[PDB]
Design an enzyme around this catalytic site. Sequence first.
Site, PDB file in Angstrom:
ATOM      1  N   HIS A  40       0.810  -1.195   0.000  1.00  0.00           N
ATOM      2  CA  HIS A  40       0.000   0.000   0.000  1.00  0.00           C
ATOM      3  C   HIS A  40       0.857   1.265   0.000  1.00  0.00           C
ATOM      4  CE1 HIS A  40       0.188   0.231   4.543  1.00  0.00           C
ATOM      5  NE2 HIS A  40       0.073   1.518   4.270  1.00  0.00           N
ATOM      6  N   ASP A  84       0.038  -7.595   1.803  1.00  0.00           N
ATOM      7  CA  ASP A  84       0.482  -6.206   1.789  1.00  0.00           C
ATOM      8  C   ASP A  84       2.004  -6.141   1.893  1.00  0.00           C
ATOM      9  OD1 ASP A  84       0.510  -3.438   1.758  1.00  0.00           O
ATOM     10  OD2 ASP A  84      -0.267  -3.195   3.793  1.00  0.00           O
ATOM     11  N   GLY A 173       1.989   6.709   8.629  1.00  0.00           N
ATOM     12  CA  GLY A 173       3.345   7.147   8.368  1.00  0.00           C
ATOM     13  C   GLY A 173       4.394   6.133   8.776  1.00  0.00           C
ATOM     14  N   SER A 175       3.706   2.975   8.142  1.00  0.00           N
ATOM     15  CA  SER A 175       3.400   1.951   7.159  1.00  0.00           C
ATOM     16  C   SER A 175       4.597   1.550   6.348  1.00  0.00           C
ATOM     17  CB  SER A 175       2.334   2.446   6.202  1.00  0.00           C
ATOM     18  OG  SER A 175       1.062   2.425   6.833  1.00  0.00           O
ATOM     19  N   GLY A 176       4.737   0.248   6.122  1.00  0.00           N
ATOM     20  CA  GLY A 176       5.830  -0.288   5.340  1.00  0.00           C
ATOM     21  C   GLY A 176       7.075  -0.603   6.139  1.00  0.00           C
TER      22      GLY A 176
HETATM   23  C1  LIG Z   1      -2.945  -1.211   4.160  1.00  0.00           C
HETATM   24  C2  LIG Z   1      -3.616  -0.200   3.557  1.00  0.00           C
HETATM   25  C3  LIG Z   1      -3.436   1.253   4.017  1.00  0.00           C
HETATM   26  C4  LIG Z   1      -3.180   1.555   5.355  1.00  0.00           C
HETATM   27  C5  LIG Z   1      -2.981   2.884   5.762  1.00  0.00           C
HETATM   28  C6  LIG Z   1      -2.806   3.091   7.255  1.00  0.00           C
HETATM   29  O1  LIG Z   1      -3.359   3.989   7.844  1.00  0.00           O
HETATM   30  N1  LIG Z   1      -2.032   2.138   7.932  1.00  0.00           N
HETATM   31  C7  LIG Z   1      -1.901   1.976   9.324  1.00  0.00           C
HETATM   32  C8  LIG Z   1      -0.731   1.515   9.878  1.00  0.00           C
HETATM   33  C9  LIG Z   1      -0.714   1.211  11.221  1.00  0.00           C
HETATM   34  C10 LIG Z   1      -1.872   1.335  11.965  1.00  0.00           C
HETATM   35  C11 LIG Z   1      -1.853   0.943  13.412  1.00  0.00           C
HETATM   36  N2  LIG Z   1      -0.984   0.061  13.845  1.00  0.00           N
HETATM   37  N3  LIG Z   1      -2.828   1.396  14.291  1.00  0.00           N
HETATM   38  C12 LIG Z   1      -3.069   1.728  11.405  1.00  0.00           C
HETATM   39  C13 LIG Z   1      -3.086   2.031  10.061  1.00  0.00           C
HETATM   40  C14 LIG Z   1      -3.098   3.927   4.858  1.00  0.00           C
HETATM   41  C15 LIG Z   1      -2.922   5.269   5.244  1.00  0.00           C
HETATM   42  C16 LIG Z   1      -3.963   6.188   5.104  1.00  0.00           C
HETATM   43  C17 LIG Z   1      -3.768   7.509   5.484  1.00  0.00           C
HETATM   44  C18 LIG Z   1      -2.526   7.901   5.964  1.00  0.00           C
HETATM   45  C19 LIG Z   1      -2.254   9.327   6.427  1.00  0.00           C
HETATM   46  O2  LIG Z   1      -3.177  10.105   6.619  1.00  0.00           O
HETATM   47  N4  LIG Z   1      -0.899   9.695   6.664  1.00  0.00           N
HETATM   48  C20 LIG Z   1      -0.552  11.002   7.147  1.00  0.00           C
HETATM   49  C21 LIG Z   1      -0.517  12.132   6.117  1.00  0.00           C
HETATM   50  C22 LIG Z   1       0.835  12.315   5.458  1.00  0.00           C
HETATM   51  C23 LIG Z   1      -0.336  11.775   4.658  1.00  0.00           C
HETATM   52  N5  LIG Z   1      -1.544   7.006   6.099  1.00  0.00           N
HETATM   53  C24 LIG Z   1      -1.704   5.726   5.749  1.00  0.00           C
HETATM   54  C25 LIG Z   1      -0.495   4.822   5.920  1.00  0.00           C
HETATM   55  O3  LIG Z   1       0.013   4.255   4.903  1.00  0.00           O
HETATM   56  O4  LIG Z   1       0.022   4.654   7.061  1.00  0.00           O
HETATM   57  C26 LIG Z   1      -3.345   3.620   3.525  1.00  0.00           C
HETATM   58  C27 LIG Z   1      -3.519   2.297   3.102  1.00  0.00           C
HETATM   59  O5  LIG Z   1      -3.778   1.938   1.747  1.00  0.00           O
HETATM   60  C28 LIG Z   1      -4.108   2.951   0.798  1.00  0.00           C
END
Ligand SMILES: C=Cc1cc(C(=O)Nc2ccc(C(=N)N)cc2)c(-c2ccc(C(=O)NCC3CC3)nc2C(=O)O)cc1OC
Length: 221
Positions: A40, A84, A173, A175-176
Amino acid sequence: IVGGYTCGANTVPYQVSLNSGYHFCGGSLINSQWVVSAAHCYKSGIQVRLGEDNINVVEGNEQFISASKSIVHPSYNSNTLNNDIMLIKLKSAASLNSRVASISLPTSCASAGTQCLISGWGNTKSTSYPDVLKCLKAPILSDSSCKSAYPGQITSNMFCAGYLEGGKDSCQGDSGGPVVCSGKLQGIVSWGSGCAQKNKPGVYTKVCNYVSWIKQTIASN
Ligand SMILES: C=Cc1cc(C(=O)Nc2ccc(C(=N)N)cc2)c(-c2ccc(C(=O)NCC3CC3)nc2C(=O)O)cc1OC
Ligand SMILES: [Ca+2]
């Protein structure tokens, strides 16, 4: 990372920042020319930033290397988030040293109860984005607790880690980025409902299921 601590500069030497004009995801260096991240996190025009602590200041240990190729898992489903995981090849090999180092892939999966290290530059509030790398020590949760938390959503390619009481989790943020347990990359920060909420632990890609795909992909690319 919510409820974590400042890692310390370059103490997580396999942690990379994916940059497309700004930090947008983490990743893990697994050899001199390949990074593992979340599917993602896919986008065009990625620069991999290794050796980072403060992502807004050039501190002297960075290596900035553009991606030459990204490979999203063939079976990634962006609706369910199954599979993912993505590989990123660097245009040139990183120079490996004490502060920029690869992390070992697992030879076996990790069990519930194992303590792991999760790290990243994601949100620290369940909005405030840090400049330096944050860390969290967290245990893998049982499959049953994970499924109970997220009914109908947890596949065999996912595991939960963290704290059901809330307060400590990865976040947007992060993520990955890596989940490392006893020196092995067992997870990738994938998803979760909000961050650090009660009964909503983080969900992570289960890396041990992908080792054969990773190895064969690297061997032919
Ligand atoms: C797998 C799909 C998936 C996940 C996220 C995401 O939320 N994962 C995440 C990681 C951990 C935890 C936890 N443990 N609690 C919860 C959620 C997102 C995503 C959406 C929105 C923003 C954002 O608003 N960023 C800040 C702003 C600079 C942009 N970030 C992300 C991201 O990749 O992290 C986008 C996805 O597919 C498009
Ligand atoms: Ca820096």
